[PDB]
Design an enzyme around this catalytic site. Structure first.
Site, PDB file in Angstrom:
ATOM      1  N   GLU A  36      65.698  55.473  13.408  1.00 43.60           N
ATOM      2  CA  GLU A  36      65.495  56.141  14.686  1.00 43.60           C
ATOM      3  C   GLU A  36      65.994  55.282  15.844  1.00 43.60           C
ATOM      4  OE1 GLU A  36      61.583  58.142  15.167  1.00 43.60           O
ATOM      5  OE2 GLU A  36      61.256  57.606  13.064  1.00 43.60           O
ATOM      6  N   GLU A  84      66.708  60.304   7.371  1.00 43.10           N
ATOM      7  CA  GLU A  84      66.946  59.536   8.586  1.00 43.10           C
ATOM      8  C   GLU A  84      67.791  58.299   8.301  1.00 43.10           C
ATOM      9  OE1 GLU A  84      63.472  58.956  11.238  1.00 43.10           O
ATOM     10  OE2 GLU A  84      62.460  60.441   9.978  1.00 43.10           O
ATOM     11  N   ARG A 118      60.076  66.570   7.667  1.00 39.89           N
ATOM     12  CA  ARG A 118      59.018  66.683   8.665  1.00 39.89           C
ATOM     13  C   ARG A 118      59.584  67.163   9.997  1.00 39.89           C
ATOM     14  NH1 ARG A 118      57.866  60.215   9.962  1.00 39.89           N
ATOM     15  NH2 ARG A 118      59.983  59.739  10.706  1.00 39.89           N
ATOM     16  N   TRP A 160      47.304  57.710  19.803  1.00 43.53           N
ATOM     17  CA  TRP A 160      48.682  57.551  19.356  1.00 43.53           C
ATOM     18  C   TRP A 160      49.498  58.837  19.452  1.00 43.53           C
ATOM     19  CZ3 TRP A 160      44.425  57.124  16.018  1.00 43.53           C
ATOM     20  CH2 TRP A 160      44.269  58.172  15.096  1.00 43.53           C
ATOM     21  N   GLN A 253      55.820  52.304  18.260  1.00 39.50           N
ATOM     22  CA  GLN A 253      57.204  52.752  18.377  1.00 39.50           C
ATOM     23  C   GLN A 253      57.414  54.207  18.809  1.00 39.50           C
ATOM     24  OE1 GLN A 253      58.818  55.322  16.680  1.00 39.50           O
ATOM     25  NE2 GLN A 253      60.334  54.429  15.287  1.00 39.50           N
ATOM     26  N   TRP A 303      45.108  40.661  16.251  1.00 41.16           N
ATOM     27  CA  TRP A 303      44.491  40.927  14.958  1.00 41.16           C
ATOM     28  C   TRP A 303      44.615  39.739  14.007  1.00 41.16           C
ATOM     29  CZ3 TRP A 303      40.977  43.894  12.981  1.00 41.16           C
ATOM     30  CH2 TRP A 303      40.879  44.040  11.585  1.00 41.16           C
ATOM     31  N   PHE A 356      45.289  45.410  20.079  1.00 40.66           N
ATOM     32  CA  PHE A 356      45.846  44.988  18.801  1.00 40.66           C
ATOM     33  C   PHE A 356      46.982  44.001  19.042  1.00 40.66           C
ATOM     34  CE2 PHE A 356      48.651  45.633  15.052  1.00 40.66           C
ATOM     35  CZ  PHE A 356      47.732  45.334  14.053  1.00 40.66           C
ATOM     36  N   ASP A 365      41.111  48.830  20.923  1.00 34.89           N
ATOM     37  CA  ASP A 365      40.464  49.423  19.758  1.00 34.89           C
ATOM     38  C   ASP A 365      39.147  48.732  19.425  1.00 34.89           C
ATOM     39  OD1 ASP A 365      42.473  47.298  19.002  1.00 34.89           O
ATOM     40  OD2 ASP A 365      41.417  47.489  17.086  1.00 34.89           O
ATOM     41  N   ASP A 367      38.067  48.095  16.308  1.00 34.00           N
ATOM     42  CA  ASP A 367      38.274  47.185  15.189  1.00 34.00           C
ATOM     43  C   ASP A 367      38.571  45.771  15.677  1.00 34.00           C
ATOM     44  OD1 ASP A 367      39.010  46.173  12.516  1.00 34.00           O
ATOM     45  OD2 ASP A 367      39.272  48.298  12.025  1.00 34.00           O
ATOM     46  N   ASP A 368      39.640  45.624  16.455  1.00 33.85           N
ATOM     47  CA  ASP A 368      40.022  44.322  16.991  1.00 33.85           C
ATOM     48  C   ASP A 368      38.876  43.702  17.782  1.00 33.85           C
ATOM     49  OD1 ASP A 368      42.902  43.586  16.410  1.00 33.85           O
ATOM     50  OD2 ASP A 368      43.214  45.611  17.187  1.00 33.85           O
ATOM     51  N   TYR A 411      39.900  54.215  18.766  1.00 36.25           N
ATOM     52  CA  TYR A 411      40.264  54.121  20.174  1.00 36.25           C
ATOM     53  C   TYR A 411      39.352  54.938  21.085  1.00 36.25           C
ATOM     54  CZ  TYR A 411      44.571  52.024  18.367  1.00 36.25           C
ATOM     55  OH  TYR A 411      45.480  51.210  17.730  1.00 36.25           O
ATOM     56  N   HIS A 442      33.045  46.794   9.895  1.00 35.74           N
ATOM     57  CA  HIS A 442      33.459  45.635  10.678  1.00 35.74           C
ATOM     58  C   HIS A 442      32.583  45.471  11.915  1.00 35.74           C
ATOM     59  CE1 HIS A 442      37.849  45.744   8.947  1.00 35.74           C
ATOM     60  NE2 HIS A 442      36.931  45.469   8.037  1.00 35.74           N
ATOM     61  N   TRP A 480      42.198  52.239   7.350  1.00 36.45           N
ATOM     62  CA  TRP A 480      43.296  51.371   7.760  1.00 36.45           C
ATOM     63  C   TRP A 480      43.536  50.245   6.760  1.00 36.45           C
ATOM     64  CZ3 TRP A 480      45.287  53.486  12.208  1.00 36.45           C
ATOM     65  CH2 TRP A 480      44.421  54.317  12.939  1.00 36.45           C
ATOM     66  N   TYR A 486      39.291  48.044  -0.285  1.00 38.86           N
ATOM     67  CA  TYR A 486      39.269  47.575   1.095  1.00 38.86           C
ATOM     68  C   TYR A 486      38.009  48.067   1.795  1.00 38.86           C
ATOM     69  CZ  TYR A 486      40.585  47.070   6.029  1.00 38.86           C
ATOM     70  OH  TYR A 486      40.611  46.745   7.366  1.00 38.86           O
ATOM     71  N   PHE A 592      48.463  55.916   7.976  1.00 41.55           N
ATOM     72  CA  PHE A 592      48.062  57.303   7.773  1.00 41.55           C
ATOM     73  C   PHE A 592      48.003  57.592   6.278  1.00 41.55           C
ATOM     74  CE2 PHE A 592      50.376  57.847  11.966  1.00 41.55           C
ATOM     75  CZ  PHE A 592      49.212  57.952  12.719  1.00 41.55           C
ATOM     76  N   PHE A 596      52.002  57.220   6.324  1.00 40.30           N
ATOM     77  CA  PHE A 596      52.548  55.984   6.867  1.00 40.30           C
ATOM     78  C   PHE A 596      51.770  54.783   6.341  1.00 40.30           C
ATOM     79  CE2 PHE A 596      53.603  53.011  10.434  1.00 40.30           C
ATOM     80  CZ  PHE A 596      54.986  53.075  10.292  1.00 40.30           C
ATOM     81  N   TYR A 600      50.721  44.054   6.251  1.00 38.94           N
ATOM     82  CA  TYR A 600      50.338  42.902   7.058  1.00 38.94           C
ATOM     83  C   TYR A 600      50.641  41.605   6.315  1.00 38.94           C
ATOM     84  CZ  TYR A 600      47.744  46.412   9.755  1.00 38.94           C
ATOM     85  OH  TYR A 600      47.394  47.511  10.506  1.00 38.94           O
TER      86      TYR A 600
END
Ligand SMILES: C=CCN(C)C/C=C/COc1cc2c(cc1F)c(-c1ccc(Br)cc1)nn2C
Ligand SMILES: C=CCN(C)C/C=C/COc1cc2c(cc1F)c(-c1ccc(Br)cc1)nn2C
Ligand SMILES: CCCCCCCCOCCOCCOCCOCCO
Ligand SMILES: CCCCCCCCOCCOCCOCCOCCO
Lengths: 619, 619
Positions: A36, A84, A118, A160, A253, A303, A356, A365, A367-368, A411, A442, A480, A486, A592, A596, A600
């Site tokens: 992209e 793509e 998509r 997002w 992005q 993070w 983040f 967020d 979490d962070d 968020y 957390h 996540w 996890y 996701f 997605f 890390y």
């Protein structure tokens, strides 16, 4: 025995730490980012041959035998990602003749072609004139008129998706077309006899929305659109007001790219917002040793720093380690003190959460924030004043973010609207931001360090939430992070710190689950397919991180001194590298579920250390 | 004889030209710029001791014997300018005891004190907590609700005042206070027995506005202001949308400074707009050889380049001089191609005008545009394509900017509203932007080069305007330049190029006027007092520029071969410096008649050359 492993893992993390005193490892995703980006440059008429080459090497490199591209390593061939990537290559110079193109092209055809991609994929191809907008979900700027408490208002979407919808509303309002050179035309994406297997909305598509969309396209052809002028401006200003300091939008992005495109359509290429928004991309770019170049979907400076600190602390390093202080000080300067989109639901809530990435004040967020604060609560900074005050601010913010079900989102609060999950446009990943198990865990894990136990109502409400969400097999879904290993590891670890009795039935039923999935190699592994096929729940090649998570679940449950316990520890000790690091050719992060996936880098080093750190505590 | 003068003046201008191929000389004004800058840093809590020193040297340097500060060199002591300069010094470190402070302080008291200063002066002092806001003209954000065709709408004000009003509306909405250290407190500004001689509105104050203001202050004390929240946002977005590329606002100091302050009040110090807006100041700053530092109220890169080219061309240099080409090319890249606030009155008008400074797309003026285009029409650029096209675009834009009276304004069209000239706030300089003589002349002077004569209606309408505006003594007022010698010289020069007969009665009556004011030294001079006292019309110390202007009026009138003609030429030839330059310790530029005066550095070099250039043509 394991001591040598820790000492080596410790000195390693300390070497990866930057001068400023923070940690920041690259964030992996898929080639759609670079693909992209290539098109973005074309749209903005700012192509750099030298850069294109670095992008070409990358694309080909990530291409597998069959000549396709997956969302994650060792995963099934993804159509969208491949399409793509195909268009990008052919534009850079590749010819449909070359083998890499052949195998890829054939795969795209064996799936129905472009008609099976998509909305986004079809959208970009529409921005270049390779696909008619008429067959693309319409998103009118008028959506900016919807009040705060109305159906489908920009504030009912996920932070997002929100920014994306607002940016695209302007783009789709003009439906601009940026023709590609005849040499790049990709009509072959249509040549296919296979029936087009289009993807429906996430939560299903209702005839209402289907009709409403058809109506929009019609109204989109009229000669006069009343108030649409103001509708656009409303979107433009909305973006200008929430532009990240680094020049991005949300730190991700998607909205960033579309935002720039929107500005280009408004002839604002010479406007500060655009200028800054463009030159800010370089920060997310990364130079690959093999001559390649990639664009991180996002960055995890805060993070990484947060987790890293907790890991080293639980490892053994003093609470006032001069090297850890560099982090504590750094983190304090990251704390946000200005109202964000979250204020829309909590006006009387004082800012105190963290972001983040580096500079992203309008989107902190939970979490962070939880991790950062909890990370500071274990350090002794020279200025106990700001450290004491900072924790308090962030602490209260989190509490004020607790949703109705007692759980914590990411968020926003109570962002559980089920309307956006039916819009024709939304067909990729999540669209809303409802409370999750991992995040909540957390949060409790954070309060636990302070002492707050089950006695405190807020804690109880959270526990009840986790109990009602626990899966039949006593496992906890991973939002996540891939996946059950996890979530389960996060929950148990939290419930143990909040005072809850680890002997409890539902608790034990969770630990047993962990030992029942311990691979032969003594380690734990869970492939990303666990989101699509349940038969992979807890199954997959063992990884340093996943092994560490499932390891903490046991150490917390009291089974730290067990067979499966010492078994996993052995894995981490052996699989360790000479330099004290760890490898992990598989993604363990999740953006996701089934759409997605992220990877890390620090996870393979941090968690393994944290796990061993807590294991050295049980003895 | 005069040849040597030209050859020396030519090689000089060519040496002052920068690498990029443009000319840019400093713009002088008064100490209020630096004074307010000092306070700005205090407000933004960003003070630099090293910088303060450079500002202190400057302030003292500009202070005269009596210990005061004037708007222009050799001008009367200005209260406002002195007050702000006084506060600045005392804040930097100066003590009310030191002589410089004594003489200045006494002057402030002998004028009524702070109660006799303009609104702005009292406003800043209010921003620091040295003056109550209750006694400061109110400007509510609600003004942003006024439609396009309503009384006192932001679009009825001058482009310069507009941005200021919008920025301040937010500031005055919160009426913030930034306390000064006890060491800087300036209460002595009140200690005075002399009656406060306050300054009324420009065009007078009506009881209506006086009452309306009193009403606002009252409504400003209520506990709830409905829709004021949106009113502010409307102003915020308005600014964000029109922020200059260099980070400024309009290219001037006023709105720029207030805009930053507004952003600070909204906790947006970490927003891109602010960041950029702040670091952009350095560009307007200038390092003085004597260790001083000043802040240009604005920059004239384009303006200087334009005139410089015309001067060198009329001098003798070829139309394709490789050195002049650098300018032609540069200018072409400066042309604006995006709609500005002017579009509000001319939606169907295609962009093509130029700005005064580097990057200021949303505020192209007619003056610069006319000069730039006309400057290009006398050059031969390698690409006759863009040169031919550029001129056309700018040409048509100017034509579409012609007001109703056939005259040309500066930024907007028919901006002749007489309502804003009564508001309590507006009490300094102009507030509207009506058509002027000088600007119009420059416009006709432009078309003239192309050939368009009096036959063309547009030209005729303009001529009629000039004829009806001609003063009794056959002189023409000078709006953006001191003064009658500037206007008259501009008009006659234009009317001569448009085909009009120079033998005409009103024309001759103008030339005679010029010869009747030729100082004994053979040169022409007109002090800035000509705006206050008419007895100075055409009177004042001779200056290179003014002498050149009055010289062109004669050369154009056909009296180039006259006594007073050769007389002035002698002056320029003699007063010339060894390096071929020229001195001018007096301002010749005008911002606001009797309020703000500017000093264009290049004027002393360019015009003198242009004058001699045209004189060498008559023979
Ligand atoms: C547990 C760690 C912190 N926690 C708080 C998760 C946030 C991670 C930030 O990284 C990303 C967030 C993203 C995304 C990517 C990230 F790397 C996308 C996204 C990706 C593709 C498309 Br298409 C649309 C959106 N949305 N969102 C929120
Ligand atoms: C003939 C030359 C071009 N012509 C087009 C005049 C424009 C000159 C640009 O310089 C300035 C313009 C300004 C100002 C200052 C400049 F140097 C102010 C101004 C000054 C003080 C305060 Br208080 C408020 C406004 N307003 N405006 C338009
Ligand atoms: C964002 C909606 C796009 C509509 C833009 C049309 C602009 C019409 O101009 C009318 C006059 O206003 C001048 C302002 O231009 C300044 C920047 O605002 C950004 C988009 O034009
Ligand atoms: C310009 C209005 C000033 C009001 C400030 C109160 C701040 C509360 O914000 C409401 C929540 O909306 C989220 C957006 O924050 C984005 C940045 O806009 C800047 C200042 O409002």
């Amino acid at each position: 025995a394991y001591a040598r492993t820790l000492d080596r893992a410790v000195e390693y993390l300390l070497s990866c730490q930057k001068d400023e005193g923070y940690w920041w490892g690259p964030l992996l995703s898929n080639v759609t980012m670079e693909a992209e980006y290539v098109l973005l440059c074309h749209i903005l008429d700012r192509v750099d041959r030298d850069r294109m080459e670095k992008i070409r090497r990358y694309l080909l490199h990530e291409q597998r035998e069959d000549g396709t591209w997956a969302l994650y390593p060792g995963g099934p061939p993804d159509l969208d990602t491949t399409i793509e990537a195909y268009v990008a290559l052919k534009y850079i110079g590749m010819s449909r003749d070359e083998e890499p193109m052949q195998k890829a092209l054939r795969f795209i055809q064996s799936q129905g072609g472009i008609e099976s991609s998509r909305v986004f994929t079809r959208m970009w191809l529409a921005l270049v004139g390779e696909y008619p907008w008429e067959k693309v979900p319409m998103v009118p700027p008028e959506i900016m008129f919807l009040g705060k408490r109305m159906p489908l208002n920009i504030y009912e979407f996920g932070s997002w998706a929100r920014a994306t919808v607002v940016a695209l509303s302007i783009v789709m309002s003009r439906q601009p077309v940026f023709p590609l050179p005849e040499r790049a035309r990709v009509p072959e994406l249509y040549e296919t006899d296979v029936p087009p297997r289009r993807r429906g909305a996430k939560g299903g598509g209702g005839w209402i929305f289907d009709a409403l969309d058809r109506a929009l396209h019609g109204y989109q052809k009229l000669s006069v659109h009343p108030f649409r002028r103001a509708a656009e401006i409303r979107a433009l200003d909305w973006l200008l007001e929430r532009q990240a300091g680094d020049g991005s939008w949300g730190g991700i992005q998607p909205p960033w790219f579309y935002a720039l495109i929107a500005l280009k359509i408004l002839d604002m290429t010479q406007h500060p917002a655009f200028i800054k928004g463009w030159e800010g991309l370089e920060l997310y770019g990364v130079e690959l040793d093999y001559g390649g170049w990639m664009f991180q979907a996002s960055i995890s400076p805060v993070w990484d720093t947060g987790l890293a600190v907790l890991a080293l602390r639980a490892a053994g390093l003093p609470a006032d380690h001069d090297r850890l202080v560099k982090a504590g000080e750094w983190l304090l300067d990251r704390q946000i003190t200005v109202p964000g989109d979250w204020a829309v639901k909590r006006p009387n809530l004082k800012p105190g959460g963290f972001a983040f990435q580096f500079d992203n004040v309008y989107y902190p967020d939970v979490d962070d924030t939880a991790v950062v604060v909890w990370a500071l609560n274990t350090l002794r900074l020279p200025d106990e004043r700001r450290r004491r005050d900072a924790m308090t601010k962030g602490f209260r913010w989190i509490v004020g973010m607790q949703s109705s079900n007692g759980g914590w989102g990411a968020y926003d609060v109570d962002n559980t609207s089920d309307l956006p999950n039916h819009i024709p446009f939304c067909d990729f990943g999540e669209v809303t931001d409802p409370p999750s198990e991992d995040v909540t865990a957390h949060v409790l894990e954070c309060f636990g360090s302070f002492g707050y136990d089950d006695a405190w109502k807020v804690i109880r409400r959270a526990v009840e939430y986790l109990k009602r969400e626990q899966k039949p097999d006593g496992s906890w879904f991973g939002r996540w992070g891939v996946n059950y290993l996890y979530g389960t590891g996060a929950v148990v670890s939290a419930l143990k710190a909040v005072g809850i009795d680890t002997r409890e039935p539902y608790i034990q039923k969770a630990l047993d689950w962990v030992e029942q999935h311990q691979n032969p190699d003594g380690g734990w592994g869970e492939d990303c397919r666990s989101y699509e096929d349940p038969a992979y729940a807890g199954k997959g090649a063992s990884t340093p991180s996943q092994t560490a998570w499932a390891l903490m679940a046991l150490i917390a449950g009291g089974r730290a001194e067990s067979e499966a316990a010492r078994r996993g520890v052995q894995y981490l000790v052996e699989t360790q590298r000479p330099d004290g690091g760890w490898d992990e050719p598989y993604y363990t992060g999740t953006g996701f579920p089934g759409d997605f996936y992220l990877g890390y880098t620090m996870y393979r080093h941090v968690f393994p250390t944290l796990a061993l750190g807590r294991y050295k505590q049980a003895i």
